[PDB]
Motif scaffolding. Structure first.
Motif, short mmCIF file in Angstrom:
data_model
loop_
_atom_site.label_atom_id
_atom_site.label_comp_id
_atom_site.label_asym_id
_atom_site.label_seq_id
_atom_site.Cartn_x
_atom_site.Cartn_y
_atom_site.Cartn_z
N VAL A 195 5.19 6.92 -11.27
CA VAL A 195 6.31 6.50 -10.37
C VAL A 195 5.79 5.69 -9.18
CG1 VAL A 195 8.09 7.40 -8.76
CG2 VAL A 195 7.65 8.55 -10.97
N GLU A 196 4.68 6.11 -8.56
CA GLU A 196 4.35 5.73 -7.17
C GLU A 196 3.23 4.69 -7.09
OE1 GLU A 196 5.45 10.15 -5.46
OE2 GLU A 196 3.84 9.00 -4.52
N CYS A 197 2.41 4.55 -8.13
CA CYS A 197 1.16 3.79 -8.03
C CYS A 197 1.23 2.45 -8.77
CB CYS A 197 -0.02 4.61 -8.52
SG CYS A 197 -0.33 6.13 -7.59
N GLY A 198 0.41 1.51 -8.34
CA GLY A 198 0.21 0.21 -9.02
C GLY A 198 1.37 -0.73 -8.80
N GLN A 199 2.20 -0.52 -7.77
CA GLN A 199 3.40 -1.36 -7.51
C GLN A 199 3.35 -1.93 -6.09
OE1 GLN A 199 6.94 0.89 -8.69
NE2 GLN A 199 5.57 2.19 -9.88
N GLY A 200 2.21 -1.84 -5.43
CA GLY A 200 2.10 -2.25 -4.02
C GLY A 200 2.71 -1.23 -3.07
N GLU A 201 2.75 -1.60 -1.79
CA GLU A 201 3.16 -0.73 -0.67
C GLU A 201 4.42 0.07 -1.04
OE1 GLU A 201 3.44 -3.07 2.88
OE2 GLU A 201 3.15 -1.36 4.18
N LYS A 202 4.36 1.41 -0.95
CA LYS A 202 5.50 2.29 -1.32
C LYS A 202 5.59 3.48 -0.36
CE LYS A 202 7.27 2.61 -5.93
NZ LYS A 202 8.50 3.29 -5.45
N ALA A 203 6.81 3.86 0.03
CA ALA A 203 7.12 4.83 1.11
C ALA A 203 6.50 6.20 0.76
CB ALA A 203 8.61 4.93 1.34
N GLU A 204 6.63 6.62 -0.50
CA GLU A 204 6.22 7.99 -0.90
C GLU A 204 4.70 8.11 -0.72
OE1 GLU A 204 10.05 7.17 -3.16
OE2 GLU A 204 8.29 6.02 -2.55
N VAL A 205 3.95 7.07 -1.08
CA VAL A 205 2.47 7.03 -1.03
C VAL A 205 2.02 7.06 0.43
CG1 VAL A 205 0.41 5.76 -1.68
CG2 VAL A 205 2.41 5.74 -3.19
N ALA A 206 2.64 6.24 1.28
CA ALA A 206 2.41 6.23 2.74
C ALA A 206 2.60 7.63 3.32
CB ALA A 206 3.31 5.21 3.39
N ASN A 207 3.65 8.32 2.89
CA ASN A 207 4.06 9.65 3.42
C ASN A 207 2.96 10.65 3.07
OD1 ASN A 207 5.65 12.40 2.67
ND2 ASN A 207 6.44 11.44 4.53
N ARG A 208 2.48 10.60 1.83
CA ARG A 208 1.34 11.46 1.43
C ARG A 208 0.16 11.15 2.33
NH1 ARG A 208 2.28 13.58 -3.75
NH2 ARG A 208 3.98 12.53 -4.89
N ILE A 209 -0.08 9.87 2.62
CA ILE A 209 -1.25 9.50 3.47
C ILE A 209 -1.04 10.06 4.89
CG2 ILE A 209 -2.51 7.60 4.53
CD1 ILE A 209 -2.02 6.03 1.90
N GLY A 210 0.16 9.90 5.45
CA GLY A 210 0.48 10.32 6.84
C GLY A 210 0.13 11.79 7.03
#
Length: 243
Positions: free
Chosen positions: A202-217
């Motif tokens: 769902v979240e990877c290999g598509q460029g900048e994405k909100a869910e991935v940023a949130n995990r990083i935060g």
């Protein structure tokens, strides 16, 4: 012992707003339950030097905080203080039944997301139940009614390689080397590949994405609380999913 790295204060300061009245799981996720569960998985938060142990707990709480977040843009102490607000998938989720000869859908039972990793589908409740010796296929509700079991599902997931995916544990402890397939996919050691293990399709290999940023935060905040540096390759924006 994992309690020598993560104390009740570190646990509670990371998961600061989880017990606010707005959070439907308030009072469910206790430090004691987490420690009881974590001690059952040898190596979990006890592998490598103290920085490695802290990094693994920071990464684990980072990812599970994302799965359970009750955060928003204007939430007190930032959205990265609202981990572990939920214990059951929101909406009116369906039964998450995908028929399996091996792990059948128990009639009337639902396998929607529960607990810190939002374990889903009869296959996963079955596989995990078999691994932790709990009747999760027959009684998937245990994952939202019993906090030790809830944490055990999440740490089981964390510790378990599956198919072409290493364990999150191996990645978080610096014990994962990419295959040729992984290198071609641009899957590099770091927190991003942990995201990819959990929900890359769902979240990877598509460029900048909100869910991935949130995990990083969440991970950055917890790295700071633990007084360690996050290290690199935090995102999976340029990583092909595993599946």
């Amino acid at each position: 012992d994992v309690s020598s790295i993560i104390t009740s204060q570190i646990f509670n300061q990371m998961l600061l707003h989880r017990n606010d009245n707005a959070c439907p799981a308030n009072g469910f996720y206790s430090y004691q339950a987490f420690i009881n569960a974590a001690r059952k998985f040898s190596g979990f938060g006890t592998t490598g030097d103290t920085n490695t142990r802290k990094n693994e707990l920071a990464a684990f709480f980072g990812q599970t905080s994302h799965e359970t977040t009750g955060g928003w843009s204007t939430a007190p102490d930032g959205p990265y203080a609202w981990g572990y607000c939920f214990k059951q998938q929101q909406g009116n989720p369906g039964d998450y039944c995908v028929p399996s000869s091996t792990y059948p859908c128990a009639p009337g039972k639902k396998y929607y997301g529960r607990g810190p990793i939002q374990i889903s589908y009869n296959y996963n409740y079955g596989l995990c139940g078999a691994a932790i010796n709990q009747p999760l296929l027959s009684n998937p509700g245990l994952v939202a009614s019993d906090a030790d079991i809830s944490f055990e599902t999440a740490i089981w997931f964390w510790m378990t390689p599956q198919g072409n995916k290493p364990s999150c544990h191996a990645v978080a402890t610096g014990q994962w080397n990419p295959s040729s397939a992984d290198q071609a996919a641009g899957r590099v050691p770091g927190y991003g590949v942990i995201t990819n293990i959990i929900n890359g399709g769902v979240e990877c290999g598509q460029g900048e994405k909100a869910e991935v940023a949130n995990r990083i935060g969440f991970y950055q905040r917890y790295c700071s609380i633990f007084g360690i540096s996050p290290g690199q390759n935090l995102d999976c924006y340029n990583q092909r999913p595993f599946s």
